[PDB]
């Protein structure tokens, strides 16, 4: 997938965690908003680069779902032979099949929320465990609507607003405000929401999708370059899957390289810094962004530990492997520090 | 254009009041709503059938329009603003709304509540006055205010609160139709939707492997007067001048190829037959005050036994009554 970047550092952090007792610097979790249906779990999905999230027009995501990706060791390792999935409500079954996952999502979201077109705020929590994956938490939630649906109660759009709201309010998160090219950008309900939570836009990345679909005489020119409204973070133009693709078994590889192509061929001047993997470099930056912010907490916790160790130091060479590994972990926070992405 | 068909209808009508001597009644105006960019303004003009509104992509309607069809007695427009000056060209018409607008909202997005009012006057339309309104949006740019989404829905709330109104509720069909906004509002002030008619615009741009079948099958949002489909012209046609007879004419084609099986319940044409329908009954609902209102001059007439005026009018208000009559039994094509 398109986030491995962090994996060395992230590696150099659990070293630190291991020896500390306690895993003290969480990434924020990376969670989806917008209008229902414009490409949000698409997205979600892109940065794992496996094919696990039911899509598709109409209401599909009806019930948050809690992906929390695992980095998995050389020790506890097993292609997609390499990486598998838990569910919290099947306990220890264990699925190597991803088709399997996105039909076991479905299934989860048809016995709380019906098979017609509920929604329910409880999570389904999966972990994705892969030794391509970074530990972080992504978030995928259902669109915001306007009228009721099916099974859906009168205040539907309320207790979709509302619980996207619980999610994004958390100050550890990152949002992905999205929005479809083929619509106005100031019709953008994720950027309305964002800013409720985060007005100064310090943890906001904006997402345009459906480039492809935008009306010919038109263009995202002037949205994708902050001249429409800007947004500091960044605002980034991605081509996932059409309904036709995933229909036709499109793979991840041929949509990212269409995606690739399409940017070359319409949008040139801007086409480095949009696409599916510049949307996941950002967000790599924002995430090594948090852990800088957070080594000086690692290292005071270190050195609460190394002082203790050192007491009992007057069971005595408990103290000394411990104190030996403390002084490896403060040398690892200095190289974690001074690493660059490149 | 495609709304002629009243035209000999609300002409025998006018007869009948002028025998009574009473005032015409206001057809009810055509308010067009929904979300920026939904297509209301390309709706709008079609049931003109000449391009005489400003049009495209981000926000372009940023005044409300009220534009008044004037049924010419044996085509041209006027502007409340520009007095006297009579236009013949409906490029400059809508070239001059463009002004106007800048004149009041300002040059970088802002909206005003001050309508234009626009009458445009014609042997081939009814009299009937068409309401074009901004769009509902949700970010605020260039200088529009914190609460430009509350003042936009207000502003639409003003126009379609009023019950002598017949909402067109536009949805473009590249978003799904549980976001219509426009439903959203009309089900507000018209909850049974007693004068609520759905338009999907931008059937032409559905993502591929994807269609509007359930939507205008009333499988989705059932919607009772009718969800209609059509095909307006994009921002490409717009910038080349495609006419309005090549852009009917590919609607056309469009809903023969990809909607075979409710192409004759769709397009533009049936849009406009649809709305014709619903002014009928508009109109038969005015007739029974009006019956009684013949019955009083007759009796009043006939009690008179300045004779030759009142043997005309007894026989003047028997032809109302005979004309009322055919109002009530005409069908509309
Ligand atoms: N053509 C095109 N279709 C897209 C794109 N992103 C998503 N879609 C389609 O949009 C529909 C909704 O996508 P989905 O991810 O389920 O939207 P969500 O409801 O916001 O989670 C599906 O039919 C997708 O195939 C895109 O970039 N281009
Ligand atoms: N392809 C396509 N484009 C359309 C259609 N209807 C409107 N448009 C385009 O949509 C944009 C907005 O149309 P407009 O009538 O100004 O929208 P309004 O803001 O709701 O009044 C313009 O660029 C039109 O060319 C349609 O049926 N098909
Ligand atoms: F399936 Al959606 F917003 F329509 F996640
Ligand atoms: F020009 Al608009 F809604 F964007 F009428
Ligand atoms: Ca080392
Ligand atoms: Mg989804
Ligand atoms: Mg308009
Ligand atoms: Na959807
Ligand atoms: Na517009």
Redesign the pocket.
């Known amino acids: 997938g398109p986030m491995e970047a962090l994996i060395p550092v992230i590696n150099k952090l659990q070293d630190v965690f291991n020896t500390v007792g306690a895993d003290i610097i969480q990434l924020p979790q990376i969670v989806?908003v917008?209008?229902?249906?414009?490409?949000?779990?698409?997205?979600l999905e892109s940065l794992v680069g496996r094919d696990l999230?039911?899509?598709?027009?109409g209401?599909?995501?009806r019930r948050p779902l809690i992906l929390q990706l695992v980095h998995v060791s050389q020790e506890d390792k097993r292609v997609e032979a390499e990486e598998w999935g838990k569910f919290l409500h099947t306990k220890n079954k264990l699925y190597t099949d991803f088709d399997e996952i996105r039909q076991e999502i479905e299934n989860e979201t048809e016995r709380i929320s019906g098979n017609n077109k509920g929604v329910s705020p409880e999570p389904i929590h999966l972990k994705i465990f892969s030794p391509n994956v970074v530990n972080l938490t992504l978030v995928?939630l259902?669109?915001m609507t306007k009228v009721p649906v099916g099974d859906q109660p009168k205040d539907i759009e309320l207790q979709i607003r509302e619980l996207i709201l619980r999610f994004i309010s958390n100050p550890n998160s990152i949002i992905l405000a999205?929005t479809a090219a083929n619509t106005d950008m100031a019709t953008s309900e994720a950027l309305k929401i964002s800013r409720e939570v985060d007005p100064d836009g310090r943890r906001t990345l904006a997402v345009i999708?459906?480039?492809?679909?935008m009306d010919a005489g038109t263009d995202a020119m002037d949205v994708l370059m902050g001249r429409v409204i800007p947004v500091k973070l960044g605002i980034i133009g991605?081509?996932?899957?059409?309904?036709l693709?995933?229909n036709n078994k499109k793979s991840v590889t041929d949509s990212i390289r269409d995606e690739y192509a399409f940017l070359q061929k319409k949008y040139p001047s801007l086409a480095n810094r949009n696409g599916t993997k510049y949307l996941a470099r950002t967000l790599n930056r924002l995430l090594m962004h948090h852990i800088r912010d957070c080594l000086p907490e690692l290292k005071t916790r270190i050195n609460v530990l190394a002082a203790q160790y050192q007491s009992l130091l007057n069971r005595r060479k408990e103290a000394a492997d411990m104190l030996k590994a403390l002084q490896g972990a403060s040398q690892i926070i200095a190289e974690i520090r001074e690493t660059h992405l490149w």
């Open positions: 989806v917008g209008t229902q249906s414009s490409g949000k779990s698409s997205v999230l039911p899509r598709g027009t209401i599909v995501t995928d259902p669109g999205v999708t459906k480039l492809d679909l991605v081509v996932n899957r059409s309904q693709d995933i």
